[PDB]
């Protein structure tokens, strides 16, 4: 089918440029238009910009100065550049396909302009947070069974948790982290019944494997 894979750094530092790449699998870039939409933590969806098929560009006027969007048909990828970032630009960034059309509107006998844009398909959203590797601890209960896999002290968000290389999809509940006073997150991923949980952290590029037994 049609999906949009967002790829880029999940951490940037102030007064530098954040770059992202959207990989398009399932459709052509000379067939559909691509748009960028971000949501700030506690805010509304904010329009960023769009590039159609014909290579023309259009952005949110407030952020046109700091924005730039290009694409490469051959790689079937679209790029985004947000310059001179500040601590508020940390947000979830969604890659999307948009359908744009300027409808004309003349009187009822026969100029005018009525503009249309909407999002067709949404990406999944990677949260750029504007480095700390996690420490993994196995968990088991005191004397069905319940097994744990505690990820300890990591920055920035997020971490992706699986069990046995994606082969265990059952009874798993990954939890929302806590914001400790130290500013280091800590989340857990319970499983309820040779159990290795695989934890990855995109910022530190770390991948560890910790087995859990009672």
């Amino acid at each position: 089918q049609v999906q949009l894979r967002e790829s880029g750094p999940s951490l940037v530092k102030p007064s530098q440029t954040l770059s992202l790449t959207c990989t398009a699998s399932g459709f052509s870039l000379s067939d559909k238009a691509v748009g960028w939409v971000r949501q700030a933590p506690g805010k509304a969806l904010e329009w960023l910009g769009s590039i159609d098929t014909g290579g023309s560009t259009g952005y949110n006027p407030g952020l046109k100065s700091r924005l730039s969007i290009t694409k490469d048909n051959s790689e079937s990828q679209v790029s985004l550049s947000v310059s001179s970032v500040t601590t508020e630009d940390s947000a979830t960034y969604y890659c999307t396909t948009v359908h744009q059309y300027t409808h004309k509107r003349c009187p009822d006998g026969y100029a005018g302009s009525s503009y249309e844009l909407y999002v067709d398909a949404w990406g999944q959203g990677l949260l750029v947070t504007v480095t700390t590797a996690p420490k993994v601890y196995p968990l088991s209960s005191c004397c069905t069974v319940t097994l744990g896999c505690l990820v300890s002290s990591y920055m920035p968000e997020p971490v992706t948790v699986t069990w046995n290389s994606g082969a265990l999809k059952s009874g798993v509940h990954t939890f929302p982290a806590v914001l400790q006073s130290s500013g280091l997150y800590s989340l857990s991923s319970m499983v309820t019944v040779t159990f290795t949980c695989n934890v990855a952290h995109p910022a530190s590029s770390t991948k560890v494997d910790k087995a859990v037994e009672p």
Partner: protein, 211 residues
């Protein structure tokens, strides 16, 4: 800028509710509104585009309508599945510039367990210890976490996460007690007393009697 929405709305289960989205004669007045559903943990899905047309896989229970400068999304037969943040949107001044709504928070009114973990043996080797109390599937999402040590209440190092929407329209949370291995053996018993609509579900672990 942004479109006006009630930010917070409430309706009852199986009934009918309506979310207003009002703007100018340059955005909503042109009248090509879109609607979107954002459930936490999932991607935003497109609901209605061009005022009234429903998108792929969108049942006709979600009906888009418009009256001049105020578009209105109406959800018929509410379900727990429908609790989310709904955003409207229309283009302004160009085909390449969109504005979104503030987004309202849909609440379905009529709808009606915690495992406790000790710190890993590996963690106590750095003389650090972390009590993990994971609560899940309670509704609604208002829980009072109180740690208990030998009948007394603990205040230091209490770290609790806010309630979070799960896939099953249920709210789950996590609470962390970051201690050291020294005073972890000091008390004789530790209790994680969570309260949910007056009921107290308690999980307890004792340091010696757990190894």
């Amino acid at each position: 800028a942004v479109l006006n929405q009630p930010s917070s709305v409430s309706g009852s289960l199986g009934q009918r509710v309506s979310i207003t989205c009002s703007g100018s004669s340059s955005n909503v007045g042109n009248g090509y509104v879109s609607w979107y559903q954002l459930i936490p943990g999932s991607a935003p899905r497109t609901l209605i585009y061009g005022d009234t047309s429903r998108a792929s896989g969108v049942p006709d229970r979600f009906s888009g309508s418009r009256s001049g400068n105020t578009a209105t999304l109406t959800i018929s037969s509410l379900q727990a599945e429908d609790e989310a943040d709904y955003f409207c949107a229309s283009a302004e001044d160009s085909s390449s510039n969109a504005v979104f709504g503030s987004g309202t928070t849909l609440t379905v009114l009529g709808q009606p367990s915690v495992t406790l973990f000790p710190p890993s043996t590996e963690e106590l080797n750095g003389n650090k210890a972390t009590l993990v109390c994971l609560i899940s599937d309670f509704y609604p999402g208002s829980v009072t976490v109180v740690w208990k040590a030998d009948g007394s209440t603990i205040t230091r190092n209490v770290e609790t996460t806010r309630a979070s929407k799960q896939s099953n329209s249920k709210y789950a949370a996590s609470s962390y007690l970051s201690l050291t291995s020294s005073d972890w053996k000091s008390k004789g018993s530790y209790s994680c007393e969570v309260t949910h609509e007056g009921s107290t579900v308690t999980k307890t672990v004792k340091p010696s009697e757990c190894s």
